Amino acid sequence: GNFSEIESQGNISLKFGFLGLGMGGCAIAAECANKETQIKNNKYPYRAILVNTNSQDFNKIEIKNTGNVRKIQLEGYEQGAARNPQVGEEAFVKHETKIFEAVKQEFEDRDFIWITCGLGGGTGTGALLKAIEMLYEHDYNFGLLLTLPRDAEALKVLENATSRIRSIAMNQEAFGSIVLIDNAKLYRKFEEENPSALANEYTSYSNKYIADALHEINLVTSSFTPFSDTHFDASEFAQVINTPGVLSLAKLELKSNQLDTENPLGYLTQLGNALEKGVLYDTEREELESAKKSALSIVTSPLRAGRLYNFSFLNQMENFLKERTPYVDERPIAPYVNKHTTKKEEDIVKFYSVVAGLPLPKRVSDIIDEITRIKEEREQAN
Numbered sequence: 081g082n083f084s085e086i087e088s089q090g091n092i093s094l095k096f097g098f099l100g101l102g103m104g105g106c107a108i109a110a111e112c113a114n115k116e117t118q119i120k121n122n123k124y125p126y127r128a129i130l131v132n133t134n135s136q137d138f139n140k141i142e143i144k145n146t147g148n149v150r151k152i153q154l155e156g157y158e159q160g161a162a163r164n165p166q167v168g169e170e171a172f173v174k175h176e177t178k179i180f181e182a183v184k185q186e187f188e189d190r191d192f193i194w195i196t197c198g199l200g201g202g203t204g205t206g207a208l209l210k211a212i213e214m215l216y217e218h219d220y221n222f223g224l225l226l227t228l229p230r231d232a233e234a235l236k237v238l239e240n241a242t243s244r245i246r247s248i249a250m251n252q253e254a255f256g257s258i259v260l261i262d263n264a265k266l267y268r269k270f271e272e273e274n275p276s277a278l279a280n281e282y283t284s285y286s287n288k289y290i291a292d293a294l295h296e297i298n299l300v301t302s303s304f305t306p307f308s309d310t311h312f313d314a315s316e317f318a319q320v321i322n323t324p325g326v327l328s329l330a331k332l333e334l335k336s337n338q339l340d341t342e343n344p345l346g347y348l349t350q351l352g353n354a355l356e357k358g359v360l361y362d363t364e365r366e367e368l369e370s371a372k373k374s375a376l377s378i379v380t381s382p383l384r385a386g387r388l389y390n391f392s393f394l395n396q397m398e399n400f401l402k403e404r405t406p407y408v409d410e411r412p413i414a415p416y417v418n419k420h421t422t423k424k425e426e427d428i429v430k431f432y433s434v435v436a437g438l439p440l441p442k443r444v445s446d447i448i449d450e451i452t453r454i455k456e457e458r459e460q461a462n
């Protein structure tokens with residue numbers, strides 16, 4: 081995930097802060113906060129506060145971005161493998177004053193905060209609702225960056241996740257977007273693109289993959305030259321990220337010759353598949369249909385832009401999004417020119433979309449059925 085070229089000539093739309101809770105949430109938050117960029121006068125664009133109980137692992141969470149990443153240790157509530165949310169909850173409440181003082185100072189210059197948490201654990205999951213109340217009570221603009229557990233994590237972790245996800249959705253109107261991450265999906269993605277990969281490379285891969293997906297859309301929305309008057313800029317991006325409900329990201333890269341405007345079915349089908357098989361989780365038409373907001377940006381070279389962004393293409397794209405998110409407040413189709421595209425990448429056309437205000441995905445229901453299976457077979461066994 082090297083965005084050096086783009087960063088040296090671009091910028092990020094929003095100054096994100098990450099409030100990590102628990103091991104996984106802190107690992108993801110740290111991965112994002114430690115990102116180094118080639119952005120003018122902004123080597124380290126992100127900040128983070130990592131809240132977790134003491135442990136060797138938590139001590140192990142590196143930290144490159146100095147000063148912009150602070151660890152807050154939940155003294156006295158180390159939980160071990162108890163996987164008990166009630167304890168995580170008590171921990172957060174007990175240390176709330178210390179935590180908020182840290183949040184207050186570190187996030188003063190932030191535009192938006194991501195409460196980052198791996199659903200299923202004790203500390204993170206347990207502290208989640210309290211953390212949300214804290215940011216809400218102090219009027220921060222914030223959203224949730226959450227992972228859903230793999231089936232192998234078993235019963236307790238799945239119930240822990242199911243419990244919070246349910247409560248989150250019920251109270252979703254109280255805050256911004258919920259960027260869901262399906263660990264099962266990403267685990268599979270890893271195996272497939274790295275068949276000969278070993279288990280020791282997954283965690284790093286998934287955390288970098290997540291951080292890169294968020295940073296990339298943050299970059300794309302403020303680093304290129306708009307071809308027209310329709311934009312998906314920092315302002316619009318903020319509008320979308322602040323929309324309640326689940327948020328889905330998609331990205332498709334095609335070679336210029338695979339994008340036929342006289343025979344659009346081919347590339348429109350690929351775009352449709354990219355939107356459903358999203359970056360962080362998998363969605364479907366039924367879910368997309370109820371989107372509250374959506375935006376799609378297209379980026380290509382000076383060489384290709386002029387010939388691509390014609391009436392036919394733009395109209396086909398307008399139609400495409402209209403069929404996918406029919407009831408959206410606004411769905412801009414925003415073509416961009418990357419004026420500094422290399423000769424080597426001259427033919428590439430990139431598509432980026434963000435869909436917001438979505439319902440919980442199918443993976444949440446599959447987890448419920450996995451929990452249901454286990455409990456019912458346990459009864460039959462009895």
Ligand SMILES: Nc1nc2c(ncn2[C@@H]2O[C@H](COP(=O)(O)OP(=O)(O)O)[C@@H](O)[C@H]2O)c(=O)[nH]1
Pocket residue numbers: 101102103104105107108163197198199200201202203204205227228229230233237263283286287
């Ligand atoms: N993507 C990702 N997910 C993680 C990571 N660590 C843990 N998780 C997930 O988050 C869930 C909770 O684990 P953890 O954060 O360690 O528990 P906690 O410290 O008690 O909150 C697990 O069930 C995993 O699915 C990580 O480094 N990356």
